[PDB]
Amino acid sequence: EMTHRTKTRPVKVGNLTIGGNNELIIQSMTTTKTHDVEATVAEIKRLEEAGCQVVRVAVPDERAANAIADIKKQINIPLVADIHFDYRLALKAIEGGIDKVRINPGNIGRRHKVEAVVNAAKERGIPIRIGVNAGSLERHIEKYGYPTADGMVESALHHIKILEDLDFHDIIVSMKASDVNLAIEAYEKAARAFDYPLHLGITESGTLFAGTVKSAAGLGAILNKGIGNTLRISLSADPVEEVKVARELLKSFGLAS
Amino acid sequence: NEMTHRTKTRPVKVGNLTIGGNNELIIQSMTTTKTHDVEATVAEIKRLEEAGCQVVRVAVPDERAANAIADIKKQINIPLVADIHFDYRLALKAIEGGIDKVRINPGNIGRRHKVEAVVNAAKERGIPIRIGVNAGSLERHILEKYGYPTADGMVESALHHIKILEDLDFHDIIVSMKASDVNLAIEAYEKAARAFDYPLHLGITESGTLFAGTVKSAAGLGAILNKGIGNTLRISLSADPVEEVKVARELLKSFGLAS
Amino acid sequence: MNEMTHRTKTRPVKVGNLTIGGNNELIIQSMTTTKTHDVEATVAEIKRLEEAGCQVVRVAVPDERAANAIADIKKQINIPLVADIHFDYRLALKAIEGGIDKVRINPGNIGRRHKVEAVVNAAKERGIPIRIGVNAGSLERHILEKYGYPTADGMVESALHHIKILEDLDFHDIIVSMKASDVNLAIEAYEKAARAFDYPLHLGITESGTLFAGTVKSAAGLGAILNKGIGNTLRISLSADPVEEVKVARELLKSFGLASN
Amino acid sequence: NEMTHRTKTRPVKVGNLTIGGNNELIIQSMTTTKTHDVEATVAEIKRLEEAGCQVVRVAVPDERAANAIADIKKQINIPLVADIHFDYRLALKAIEGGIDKVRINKVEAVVNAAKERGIPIRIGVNAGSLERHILEKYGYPTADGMVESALHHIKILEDLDFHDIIVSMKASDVNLAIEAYEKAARAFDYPLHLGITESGTLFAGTVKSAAGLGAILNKGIGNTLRISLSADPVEEVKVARELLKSFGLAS
Ligand SMILES: [Cl-]
Ligand SMILES: [Cl-]
Ligand SMILES: [Cl-]
Ligand SMILES: [Cl-]
Ligand SMILES: [Cl-]
């Protein structure tokens, strides 16, 4: 049985709550150099002007991690940081005021690294988004022979398990794929597999037109199931258009944000 | 109840094609020219043929439009379809004119001999009929029963059109459930798949700018295609009909439901 | 078995003051996206096209109001104009009387003897050429029933009958297009075309859904074709402004060291 | 000699992927980050992967990059290719770090390391860097010099019992690029790695590469391809898909 978006666990992200209500928070991400504070801030204010409620920035390095405080001081909406496995960058961004870190626990390595992150996260009440991706499933998951709905949830489970073992339940999860049937199938199962809020997203298509049609369709079928607490529409275009498609999708179903 | 999957629906012939009973959806659009202007309508259908359109609907508001069907036919490949709202003479004229499928409202037409001539006209010529229920066009008693347009009322209307034709030994039926509201559209099609075995023609009433029409159509149709129903479809957009085909092709590519 | 004729060996066919065929040049073309009857809009789109380097422009002539507007459009532009009419011969006669510089129509579609010889003699009198345009997606039913689906042999079967209708009227002022979506078919249709007849070929590829996909698919396909040494004129079809079509054609020709003259 | 069809080229493994012996080309891209900056590099690969990239090349200009190779692989799921130019040592380093393929042109020590790990070597021939003696023989860069340069390199590996070779024939002039791959395909049956060196703007490089590679693909050769652009690595994957997808050449 699927956990409706209204009975999912509430997760505080800055001043907003994701999960435990029927409000789909709109998110996006920047295209700028995260360490280029002026450019990043400029693009963020254009996203805020468009209707963006939460925005993510890639933190590939120290320059980027160092830019966090300077960015957040010049913005109004919550700022999430992208980090695949570097615990030092995780720690630097957290210290800097990020509102949430998108990091997959199982990639961090040795337990002491995993704890340095979770402890920092609890210290200032920041959540983690577990972001499962169809193109980047663990090497071992030689088990299915290719990305499948089952391989995504299992990878997801593994990541939640590490946080729950550390008494950490402030978690948001995403199951992002490029294929629509796999997309729908993945969120369906993750909703039946766990109670955390689901961050909806489909992989960027080659063109803006392809991506607009595919995402509108895939997320359309997921929202109709009563699931999803937040969403990000990924498109080969200026981020503002992602906010526009997201707004149009939610208005279409008569959904509030 | 059981949702009749698309592969479990009744196969009908629309020209040289088979709609229903399989796991593929045939793309359809409509010409924006006056059917009377032969070259104009052909020129537009040629662009749609080039684009990948598989079935095309032409305006048949009057007798001149109906009388040009054979001329259009000599110059194209794909099946020609036509919607007749009220006047049965237009349906009859279109049928004898060489149409491949007609969209009629048995209950509106009028006299029993009127419907019998069209049913027979279509039955004789071996042509299918499409029953198209539209949320904004429900019968008076339907709206009085439910109070406003609703999935159940569209389904009530559908069955009756179907029953009129079934009572005249007519079964080459395709059913459309067109609404503007996606929530209604999604429901309307889900209950139709549970209420009968005929193939369903998926369409959403166009609303807003091209940008909004494209998003809302993709959204609603995404939820319906994931339900495993739909055997044919058309995207409606105030734009060059070719754009409708583009959108339909992307949608099918996404789900892997193209012919 | 028959050798592909090299673009420099195709029959030279004059279009306006230009010569398509019997040379190593590739004439670049585009098509308007306006209503032909809207003279002002159409002439302004053509002027933008000329500015980007377009050499020949085709306009649809779907009704009588568009064919009567040919004369006034011609008076305002400096590049040869082309009427695209699928079969209505009263619309082509008007286009020809309007002073069109070429007509894109397939004679086997007209397709009544008094109707064919009329359009034929009218063109003969004005000394204007006819481009036959076979499109994989708009092939005749008797081809489809025979081959099953669109094939190169089928497109070649089609082109040959339209060509015969004309050759049988002692008309040889002909250019041929073989349009397909599938890049593999397009490539084979044009090599099969070069072996069957010596008429210069007009290279085109159906427009993909988007500008990006269209640019890649068309450069990849036409590049394949151009490298065989065939084709005498081309048109890129894109879901974009016609100016984008001219820019892709220029950069594509630039890539092969080929010129427009 | 007639050209060796892509389906008849000598199979070569790269990670879990086969390169050669089938009618489908593998998509490659290349990172732009500092290979020694691990999260940075991994982040780019992660976007590449998602976009449909199948193999990725990372620059190894020195030992910093060479040492990061292992940490990069424990994070990614597509095979990595190293690109070494002058130092035989950096290639040795990249191989110890688990590189899945080394693109390179002591000499026996590199092969022994390549033998030991069971990894191939992509001989990379380029029109912009042919040795002086073939330039002195042919006068300028040409298809005959390229194939001759590729054969002299193929010879040395073969004499050392190493046959797991993949070959590229890089040039900026479309007509030379075409002629070279045709020429290549005839001389040897090793799989071909298609690429066109970039020139001009993004617009210009997109048209040129698709045009050249289309002609090449039409001839039925090539088992792997790379679209060289000066932008986000995902733009190279975007061009590559449309191209392969248009010709009917799957993953
Ligand atoms: Cl570790
Ligand atoms: Cl450490
Ligand atoms: Cl727990
Ligand atoms: Cl009457
Ligand atoms: Cl409205």
| Distance between A210 CA and the closest CA of chain C, angstroms | 9
- For the sheet containing A25-29, what is the strand order? A171-176, A128-133, A100-102, A79-82, A54-58, A25-29, A230-232, A199-200
What does the radius of gyration of chain A's CA atoms come to, in whole angstroms?
17
- Cα D65 to Cα A13, A107, D35, distances in angstroms: 37, 21, 5
- Determine contact, residues D150/D165, Cβ cutoff 8 Å: no
A abuts D (3+ Cβ pairs < 8 Å):
yes
- The encoded tokens of residue A109 equal 């390595």
d(CA C171, CA C199): 12
Q: DSSP 3-state assignment of B220? A: helix
Contact between residue D48 and residue D237 where contact means Cβ atoms under 8 Å apart: yes
**Helix/strand/coil for C17:** coil
Helix (H, G, I), strand (E, B) or coil at C217: helix
Q: Which two tokens stand for residue D62?
A: 């020195």
Q: Which residues pair with B80 in a beta bridge?
A: B56
Give bridge partners of residue A177 from the DSSP assignment: none
**What is the C-alpha to C-alpha distance for residues D91 and A223, in angstroms, rounded to an integer?**
51
Closest CA to D80 of D15, D13, D165, D17: D15
C and D make contact (3+ CB pairs below 8 Å) = yes
Give the DSSP H or E segment for C60: strand C56-60
Q: Which ligand is nearest to the CA of B180?
A: 5
> How far away, in angstroms, is B207 Cα from ligand 5 center?
5
How many Cβ contacts (< 8 angstroms) between chains A and C? 10
Q: Where are the beta strands (DSSP E) in chain A?
A: 11-13, 16-18, 25-29, 54-58, 79-82, 100-102, 128-133, 171-176, 199-200, 230-232
| Residues of A with Cβ-Cβ distance to B223 under 8 angstroms | 220-221, 223-224
Does the bond joining A228 to the residue before it have cis omega, within 30 degrees of 0?
no
**3-state secondary structure at position B25:** strand
For B183-208, the DSSP string reads HHHHHHHHHHHHH--S-EEE-----S
Elucidation technique: X-ray
Residues in chain C: 261
- Whose CA is closest to B198, among B227, B231, B160, B234? B231
Question: Position A87: which residue type?
Answer: Y
3-state helix, strand, coil in chain B (%, to 5): 50, 15, 35
Q: What angle do CA C193, C195, C199 make, to 5 degrees?
A: 60
Contact A120/A90 with Cβ under 8 angstroms? yes
At C23, which amino acid appears?
N
What is the Cα–Cα distance from D84 to D90, expressed in whole angstroms? Answer: 7
Q: Where are the alpha helices (DSSP H) in C85-241?
A: 89-97, 113-126, 141-147, 152-167, 183-196, 211-227
DSSP string, B177-188: EE-SSHHHHHHH
The residue among D165, D168, D160, D154 whose CA lies nearest residue D107 is D160
- The partner residues of D57 in beta bridges, in order of sequence, read D30, D81
User: Roughly what angle, to the nearest 10 degrees, separates helices C39-51 and C242-255?
Assistant: 20
Interface probe for D, chosen from A33, A57, A59, A61 (most Cβ of D below 10 Å), is A61
Angle subtended by helix axes D174-187 and C211-227, to nearest 10? 60
Domains and CATH numbers, chain C: 2-261 (3.20.20.20)
CB pair distance less than 8 Å for A86 and D33: no
Q: Residue A137: its chain D contacts at CB < 8 A?
A: 77
Task: Find, among D90, D13, D63, D74, the residue nearest to D41 by Cα.
Answer: D74
Residue A226 in contact with residue A200, Cβ under 8 Å? Answer: no
Task: Please write down the HEC assignment for all residues of chain D.
Answer: CCCCCHHHCCCEEECCEEECCCCCCEEEEECCCCCCCHHHHHHHHHHHHHHCCCEEEEECCCHHHHHHHHHHHCCCCCCEEEECCCCHHHHHHHHHCCCCEEECCCHHHHHHHHHHHCCCEEEEEECCCCCHHHHHHHCCCCHHHHHHHHHHHHHHHHHCCCCCEEEEEECCCHHHHHHHHHHHHHHCCCCEEECCCCCCCHHHHHHHHHHHHHHHHHCCCCCEEECCCCCCHHHHHHHHHHHHHHHCCCC
Q: Which residues of D touch C (CB under 8 A)?
A: 174-175, 178, 200, 203-204, 206-208, 210-215, 217-218, 238-239, 242-243, 246-248
| Cross-strand pairs, C31 | C58
Q: CA angle, corner C38, sides to C32 and C44, nearest 5?
A: 55
A117 C-alpha to ligand 2 centroid (Å): 13
Evaluate whether chains D and B are touching (3 or more beta carbon pairs less than 8 Å apart).
Answer: no
Tokens standing for residue C259: 């010129």
Q: Write the residue in A209, A216, A248 that is nearest to B222 by C-beta.
A: A216
Q: Please list, in sequence order, all residues whose beta carbon lies within 8 angstroms of the beta carbon of residue C170, skipping any fewer than 6 positions away.
A: none
Q: What is the resolution of this structure in A?
A: 1.9
Where would I find the H helices in B98-240? 106-109, 112-125, 140-146, 151-166, 182-195, 210-225
Instruction: Phi first, then psi: give them for residue B202, nearest 5 degrees.
Output: -85, 125
CB contact under 8 A, C251 and D210: no
Instruction: For chain A, list residues whose CB is within 8 angstroms of any CB belonging to chain C.
Output: 206-207, 209-210
Beta strands A79-82 and A54-58 are: parallel
* Local structure of A234: helix, strand or coil: coil
> Which numbered ligand comes closest to the C-alpha of A108?
1
CA distance B249 to B236: 13
Residue A12 in contact with residue A170, Cβ under 8 Å? yes
Q: Do the chains contact at A60 and D51, CB–CB below 8 Å?
A: no
CB spacing of A135 vs D51 below 8 angstroms: yes
Q: How far apart are CA C199 and CA C212, in angstroms?
A: 32
Phi then psi for residue D194, to 5 deg, are -85, 135
Cβ contact C209–A210 (<8 Å)? yes
Q: Which of D172, D194, D246 to mutate to test the interface with C (most CBs of C within 10 A)?
A: D246
Q: Is C219's CB within 8 Å of D203's CB?
A: no
Structure tokens at B150: 């609703």
Q: How far apart are alpha carbons C81 and D179 in whole angstroms?
A: 38
